[PDB]
Amino acid sequence: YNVDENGYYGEFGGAYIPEILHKCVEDLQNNYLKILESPDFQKEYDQLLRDYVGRPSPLYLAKRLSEKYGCKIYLKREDLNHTGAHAINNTIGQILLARRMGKTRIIAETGAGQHGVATATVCALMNMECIVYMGKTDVERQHVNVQKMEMLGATVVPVTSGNMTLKDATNEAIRDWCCHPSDTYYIIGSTVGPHPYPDMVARLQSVISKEIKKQLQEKEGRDYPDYLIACVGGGSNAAGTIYHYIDDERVKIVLAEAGGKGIDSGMTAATIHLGKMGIIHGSKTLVMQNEDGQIEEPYSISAGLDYPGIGPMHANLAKQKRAQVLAINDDEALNAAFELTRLEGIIPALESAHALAALEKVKFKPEDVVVLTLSGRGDKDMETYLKYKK
Amino acid sequence: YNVDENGYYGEFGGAYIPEILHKCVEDLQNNYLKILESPDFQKEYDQLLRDYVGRPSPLYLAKRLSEKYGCKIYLKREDLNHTGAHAINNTIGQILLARRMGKTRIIAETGAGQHGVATATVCALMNMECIVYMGKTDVERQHVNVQKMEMLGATVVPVTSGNMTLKDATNEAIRDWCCHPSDTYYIIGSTVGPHPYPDMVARLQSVISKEIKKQLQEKEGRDYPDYLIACVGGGSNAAGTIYHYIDDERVKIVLAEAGGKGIDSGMTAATIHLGKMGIIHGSKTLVMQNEDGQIEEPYSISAGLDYPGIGPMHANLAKQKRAQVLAINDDEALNAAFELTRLEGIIPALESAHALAALEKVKFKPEDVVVLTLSGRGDKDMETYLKY
Ligand SMILES: Cc1ncc(COP(=O)(O)O)c(/C=N/[C@H](Cc2c[nH]c3ccccc23)C(=O)O)c1O
Numbered sequence A: 001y002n003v004d005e006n007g008y009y010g011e012f013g014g015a016y017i018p019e020i021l022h023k024c025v026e027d028l029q030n031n032y033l034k035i036l037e038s039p040d041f042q043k044e045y046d047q048l049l050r051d052y053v054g055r056p057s058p059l060y061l062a063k064r065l066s067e068k069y070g071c072k073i074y075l076k077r078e079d080l081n082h083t084g085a086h087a088i089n090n091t092i093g094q095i096l097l098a099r100r101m102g103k104t105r106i107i108a109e110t111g112a113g114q115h116g117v118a119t120a121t122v123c124a125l126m127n128m129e130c131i132v133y134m135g136k137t138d139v140e141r142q143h144v145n146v147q148k149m150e151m152l153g154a155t156v157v158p159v160t161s162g163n164m165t166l167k168d169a170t171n172e173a174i175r176d177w178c179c180h181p182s183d184t185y186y187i188i189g190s191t192v193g194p195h196p197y198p199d200m201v202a203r204l205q206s207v208i209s210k211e212i213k214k215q216l217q218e219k220e221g222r223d224y225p226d227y228l229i230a231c232v233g234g235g236s237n238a239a240g241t242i243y244h245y246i247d248d249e250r251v252k253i254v255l256a257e258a259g260g261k262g263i264d265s266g267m268t269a270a271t272i273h274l275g276k277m278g279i280i281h282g283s284k285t286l287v288m289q290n291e292d293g294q295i296e297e298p299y300s301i302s303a304g305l306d307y308p309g310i311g312p313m314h315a316n317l318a319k320q321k322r323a324q325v326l327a328i329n330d331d332e333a334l335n336a337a338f339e340l341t342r343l344e345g346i347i348p349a350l351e352s353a354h355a356l357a358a359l360e361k362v363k364f365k366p367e368d369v370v371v372l373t374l375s376g377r378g379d380k381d382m383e384t385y386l387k388y389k390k
Numbered sequence B: 001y002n003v004d005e006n007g008y009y010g011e012f013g014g015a016y017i018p019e020i021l022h023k024c025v026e027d028l029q030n031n032y033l034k035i036l037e038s039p040d041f042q043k044e045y046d047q048l049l050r051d052y053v054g055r056p057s058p059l060y061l062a063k064r065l066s067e068k069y070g071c072k073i074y075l076k077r078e079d080l081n082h083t084g085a086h087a088i089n090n091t092i093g094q095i096l097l098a099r100r101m102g103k104t105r106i107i108a109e110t111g112a113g114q115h116g117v118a119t120a121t122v123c124a125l126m127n128m129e130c131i132v133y134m135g136k137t138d139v140e141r142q143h144v145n146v147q148k149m150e151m152l153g154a155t156v157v158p159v160t161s162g163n164m165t166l167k168d169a170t171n172e173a174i175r176d177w178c179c180h181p182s183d184t185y186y187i188i189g190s191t192v193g194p195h196p197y198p199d200m201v202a203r204l205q206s207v208i209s210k211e212i213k214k215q216l217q218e219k220e221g222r223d224y225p226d227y228l229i230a231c232v233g234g235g236s237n238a239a240g241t242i243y244h245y246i247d248d249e250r251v252k253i254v255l256a257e258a259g260g261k262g263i264d265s266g267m268t269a270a271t272i273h274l275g276k277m278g279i280i281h282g283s284k285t286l287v288m289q290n291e292d293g294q295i296e297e298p299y300s301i302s303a304g305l306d307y308p309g310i311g312p313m314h315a316n317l318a319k320q321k322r323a324q325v326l327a328i329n330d331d332e333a334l335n336a337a338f339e340l341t342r343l344e345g346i347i348p349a350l351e352s353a354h355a356l357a358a359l360e361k362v363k364f365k366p367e368d369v370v371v372l373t374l375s376g377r378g379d380k381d382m383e384t385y386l387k388y
């Protein structure tokens, strides 16, 4: 269920792009693995993960949370990463690749602002020009992260097309990318876009499941859990979380996508529940489509889940029934965020709370071992959490 | 240079309290150490540091900083800890102690909001009632921490005494403690207050120096740096950073206190520079005083450094010349924060930025190995940073 030699996961994936990018995408294909696997990349990569990011991220037995659901739940604490989310695993990896390929101008899209902060973070470290596209809606709702990016010296470009969300910021980044093939590297923020971006970002996040294996070995005497649970906007934290377990049928995979106001409300981002075959941002995958077959304007309270497409990996997983996918609504997420706060003293990202909310919908046995990926911390969503509390 | 059996660092320290606290403190002294050393404690303590907090925190070689000062500078990244600061090392320890003393009501003071969030955090975790006193000036300067405390289920009590800063929040907590002796445990937020709070908190923070010795051994082939650099409000992140180095004369210690608008200006927190022998919150230490002998109202841009006292360990250390203490002014701290942000992609707390600014004030040789403790991340100070 991992990628094939042509960029495909079953029938989903590939690279579907105008000729203007054919050259630089082709360079990226058939160099990215050479670079990822070189001893130089892997040393500097691993050194920055350890000293800069603070990997490995803990695997934490959440005791009161385990008592509520009548089983053993561990949280993979990506929320403790430098910059507060899993995104930084990806930006560190991609910036090292970008430099190996001689690129000098860095762009990215962001919804939650975690990928934007993680991109401005590594660009300041490296002293490289940073431009971050962000939907206007998102710059309002995730303003703490816009501030961080501006202090880090990045240029934040509000995007005013569509409903001004991730798909739109991505559209703008892609337009930027098209005008600047020579000098610009595009740090895509999820397991989305043209091959090799899905597999690349999956590889860079795989460190998550590499650690889980070792940490479960220490704690449980076996290297596999009964369940992996992760939210999914485009697929990147889930991918990392499942990479080294993707084919291992002892491990059940539960993914939580954003149901918004409910999958039938006309306001949602439940791509698996609602999507049809399309091309989105250079990938042939499942995507929400409106009544004239346009890519649909999605909704979610969560900026990082609010994307109408899904990575081709998860399109495939879902289609094959290797992974079960749940639509989780705004309210369910909000309540699960308040849940982890009072139970474990951890304020989660609204994104990650979609994953937490899924614990209500699964029939656990007492001997079950669950690993849920806490993809980030909720500092960004405090205004929203406190509004909800009133 | 470490505490003696009486709770003194040379002439500083002790417990100078009203008689109403004599017994809680007595109970606290001469159980604290037995609990800290107990296996049950050390096992639960160590498991939460590793799994909940994310220790060991990395020791990060900051190449661009190092270039700019012409030496090797490592940042001890307490900013990466659960809650974003060193305080969680303290609150984890104290809450466990509190539960083993059979206490059920937890109170605390906070200025920067970090110690307040760390307290609210561990009280949420443990299913316990949590009250945090915070100065009114501070509830506004550091409002992102107030929001976190609220959602964690803690009662944030604004204090409007004095100039509504740490000292006043601290007076209010102590008054709560007196008034509720049987049932309440008081999680003090720095190496301050009556014995054994200063030593206890130093010990909980000592985890920092413990990691630095092993991490320097792996990175440099020796267990000790030429310089340790840390900011001090009351002195806990500092104490932690130096605890296992405190008698090692090969290691230079540089402590950065808050100069505010400047030491000779009216408006400062430069206790080592300005303070006089006195008593604050039950500790005999150096403290700022007016011409009367009243406790002088301090000022600093940084809430967590804005304290007219200092821990007894550092009064002793400064007095005996074991530690060099620099007063860093507001603007110096702000520029150093922006410097780290730009050079290493790390936004420090304004507090920790006082330590960063001290890098300007020391002449380093190229063979120097510096460890500076990055006590916190600066999400709380983003409004201040962009005003500037
Ligand atoms: C804390 C946190 N958890 C989970 C997610 C969900 O993303 P995933 O499915 O890739 O694991 C995000 C998204 N972060 C965004 C999301 C994002 C960037 N580019 C995208 C392309 C498609 C879908 C989502 C995105 C950001 O900070 O920007 C996040 O910040």
Ligand SMILES: Cc1ncc(COP(=O)(O)O)c(/C=N/[C@H](Cc2c[nH]c3ccccc23)C(=O)O)c1O
Binding pocket: B085, B086, B087, B109, B110, B111, B112, B113, B114, B115, B116, B166, B170, B188, B189, B190, B191, B192, B231, B232, B233, B234, B235, B236, B237, B238, B303, B304, B305, B307, B349, B351, B352, B375, B376, B377
């Ligand atoms: C990130 C950060 N770095 C440094 C400091 C300085 O404190 P230290 O000298 O103890 O290492 C603080 C203070 N945080 C406060 C400070 C505080 C609480 N109670 C105190 C009593 C005396 C002096 C300072 C304090 C908080 O969040 O509340 C801090 O939050």
